[PDB]
């Protein structure tokens, strides 16, 4: 009835090191990416399944919605004593009403076993999971205190910096020995140390800006950044697929919001022109300023933003640009600088650059980079700096070690191998999956490979069947996604090797053949012919051909 | 007659055709709104528009002095005796006596805790690599949640990644348009942000005044009774344990009596009172010798001020926590805490359970500090003291006469 | 009485006929910040043939029982489709998923379709389908005006009447028959 | 290579071919039945439902076929 505390396992050094990070097999399994030099980015193309799949999806959702209301009505009307949470006891309203919790109770409840799974130990290329047994219908669980390893394709460690034995761990332990774990307070009265300024300058030099700021949390950074310089008389133009933190920050700021469709620039230009002409509502006076918010790389889709067009538009119409890049600051680029490196765009064109250390550097926190005359004002106008706690010492040490490793200072040739490994793994997996006959999204280099499952009842079967094979995956669905399109999101890491990918390919091929999940058309291959290759031929021929940049449609 | 039935069909078909032939129109129309414009004219408007600078740089040199005055500690943990430098290494001081630290009990610096952190770092790594929703939640987090719930006498608890963003993510979750909130006259900034984001009616009553609260509650009750609304809405009272800016405490028993009489819920934000108030240090409720499970409904706390590690927590019953695990924005879309923090805080809680010397020593020191300044006569004409004898922080204010004269 | 600093109070109608008050600046920002998911799925792929498939299946299942009469079967399938459409579109007000604050607490889905833009192709299809069904039912088999008048009355007042622009943003509250509606 | 602490789960085809379970005379019918059952069960909501409602829907489909 309670989560047991698991005793650590005692193993020799080599076995644990292999569990955390995998050794390379052959030096031919590396790939070095090349710059784009500014050539235009083509419009993405998406494949579609047949009609009957969509019709069945519509019928499934309709039946589920009808039955949910039938049960809700009958149970609320007759059996009152059982449902005491949703009724007022003595002049006090319930914590929540039945209507807003309909989706959680009626459809999501039957799937609660595939969402939250306790684990233990360091998340590497093999993750240890706690075994649990379900009672009633996912109401409560009973734990037998047994653990077993699984392959993880769901954790945010792109460069494999999550280790228990390494230079970063040594630096963290030394920092703990030198600086205590406790801080003083807000970074305006006490709590600033030389390590903070060192990290500031290191991040500023690594990005390419002139000055920066470091915060202890990323969500708070976004939620508190916007109100410092925006007001009711300003306008914010943002995409329709931005993160929640940006939405909360803009809501707190109080400015007006206009949104444009994903990937459309003609609509963006038309919206900018119209908004400039019309002016403020009900008074038709000109706006004080206009700001453009976008994201470097979108995790739900695995697609890039067309930065040069945004820069051109902001130069022509005299607007400001804000770029959010947390998934692409360390894992993408010829040297890992970010989205500004692949396109060749000068960093000075963008106004504000933000990112977090959680995804790639193995430590928690976030930052912001801009010009000197902006940072000087912001250090005074920000509310995080003078009201909230400061960043601890071990996290700073880990971040500094990771940054100096990637930059090539502390160790000669460790970061480049990681970049090449992650690039090759992503390309190989995407090409093999597309040659099998599935449907994937991406731009041929993103670490996110979303494979689409359309029927509502196929996601739990896929999750459970992959668990039985000792593989851990994460599946998302409504409303986080469009109603028709559900998907499973793969997060590729540098710690995995090629044989693991072959094992995964065999198992996923068998499961997809069983569940009828592979439905491909001619719009996904370069020759225009639907392809269903046998597995051994795929394994034999894909790793050599994945290097050429012509086999990929987008 | 038969032609009447055909005429009905004709009338339906005609309206269908008429609606089909029409063109789309929207209230939020395009440039054609005014329009009274031509392509040549629009370019003039576009070119005439001039923007404002992103930030105003006029006054930065006037406030740079406060940036130049920030102390910095070099190569040493923040402790009682430190060495500081100011104004970018131009001036240096040594053997400084620190009276600005915000850590009260100083239990995190002892040897028995420094081993739990090292072992945890060796066995787990530094940072978690996933959200609590998918795969990030581990066994140590559950252990800390159970320990907090057992220690503070509440059914459950929820862990947050930072204490600044706890209230603005909890309070809006349980309120909607059409609800009432009664807040104190002066509250801290995070509570103000929560109230702004809550999107509900807000009423204010005078500071530490019970007559005003009673009168306003009676007026609201009478108006609601006269309104005859079919569904009862939610009601909350927002206050603070020990105020951040003035260092004064709130009277709990009167609030409990009023909330029981007028059917209101009580929300208490106690960041500066968790580790210092009470004989054992269990919070505000222990000071007045009352049960927490009935006196208070929602509690917001911080682990940084007294316990000595980053994070925050919220205490409540089972339904609240179960709904909070899905309806809270800062909880869902964020990564989990590192393991060494939670292990160290659990060890500190066990140490607090073992012995209770630090609380007594701190209370004695605070009483001495208050009496020393509040017992003199020379400073009667210059400054006044706005803090309580039990607070660990002393606040000083200039006399209103001095402010006007100077 | 004491005046709140920030007031967001729901107000109900006070007359037999009334209209909902236009939204404010903050409400407009709240609605524009996040796309609505209840009204987006109508325009997507495969969302139009579904009604035809439902009609075809309802005809077959009601005709399957030997004891039914063709006129009665078509009237019953009209009952089913009209009642289902009225319940889904015009009866229920609100959003199952939670938006910022109250948000779309006062408008129905038909009002939420396509950001309140009128004369959209989806609206044309949704208003044309019941008419085509009615004419097909009338012409298909023999009928008598007795049930025919009531059937066309129900088709008009349950499917056609709510779709007119005159009834847009409109609320009717009988003093006792129907509860008061928030404006 | 280097050994690790992972336990590999064999695939279905390998287990079947190493178990000698495959028999041409009396396995094609079983495979056909398996395909017919799974295709019927997956593409239609039985897997997120309750036992009473699932049984009711099974009886409904069975009666529809029988009629
Ligand atoms: C073969 C056979 C044939 C026959 C058959 O079986 C098969 O065929 C079957 C086919 C069935 C129908 C299928 C589909 C529906 C739609 C459904 O849709 C409800 C959705 C609405 C809510 O309904 C739920 O919640 C209600 C909560 O009151 C429940 O009501 C009371 O239920 C109990 C007493 O009945 C007691 O507990 C209490 O007295 C009270 O809870 C109700 O039962 C429950 O359903 C959503 O809309 C509202 O949302 C808010 C509610 O939260 C309202 O309030 C808000 O108002 C302001 C906005 O203006 C906000 O600002 C304020 O903050 C805020 O207060 C808002 O006004 C309004 O829009 C209503 C039921 C119906 C017609 C079914 C009937 C039964 C059948 C005929 C079966 C049948 C057996
Ligand atoms: C003796 C015999 C006498 C016969 C008497 C006849 C009596 C007729 C009884 C009618 C029973 C059915 C009436 C209501 C059943 C359906 C009502 C469901 C409404 C529940 C709440 C709706 C909330 C909408 C929010 C929502 O989740 N929206 C969407 C997603 O975001 C939604 O989830 C999806 O888009 C799916 C809906 C699309 C499926 C196509 C439906 C179109 C045709 C309707 C015909 C209904 C026929 C029923 C057999
Ligand atoms: C992952 C994600 C976050 C998460 O914030 P943390 O507090 O660092 O976990 C923030 N911003 C973006 C864009 C993200 O994708």
Numbering used by the authors:
A (entry chain C): 8 to 561
B (entry chain B): 52 to 457
C (entry chain A): 39 to 221
D (entry chain D): 3 to 69
What's in the article?
Serine palmitoyltransferase (SPT) is the rate-limiting enzyme in the synthesis of sphingolipids. It catalyzes the transfer of a palmitoyl group to L-serine, yielding 3-ketosphinganine (3-KS). SPT is highly conserved across species and consists of two large catalytic subunits (in yeast: Lcb1 and Lcb2) and interacts with a small regulatory subunit (in yeast: Tsc3). Here, we solved cryo-EM structures of the yeast SPOT complex in both monomeric and dimeric states and the monomeric SPOTS complex.
The SPOT dimer was refined to 3.4 Å resolution, with C2-symmetry imposed. We do not observe such helix crossover for the yeast SPOT dimer. A marked difference is the absence of the previously reported crossover helices at the protomer interface in our dimeric structure, which could explain why we were able to obtain monomeric SPOT complexes. The lack of the Lcb1-TM1 helix swap, previously observed in human SPT complexes, results in weaker protomer interactions and explains the presence of monomeric complexes. Both oligomeric states from the human complexes are active in vitro; however, their respective physiological relevance is unclear. In all of our structures, TM1-2 of Orm1 acts as a docking station for a 44:0;4 ceramide, which is sandwiched between Orm1 and the amphipathic helix of Lcb2. The ceramide extends out of the cytosol-facing membrane plane through interactions with two aromatic residues, Y110 and Y485, of Lcb2. Therefore, the positioning of the 44:0;4 ceramide headgroup in the immediate proximity to the conserved, substrate-tunnel-gating PATP loop and its direct interactions with Y485 and Y110 of Lcb2 effectively blocks access to the substrate tunnel from the membrane, highlighting a regulatory mechanism of ceramide-based inhibition of SPT activity. Our data show that in yeast, Orm1 does not regulate SPT via insertion of its N-terminus into the active site but rather in conjunction with ceramide.
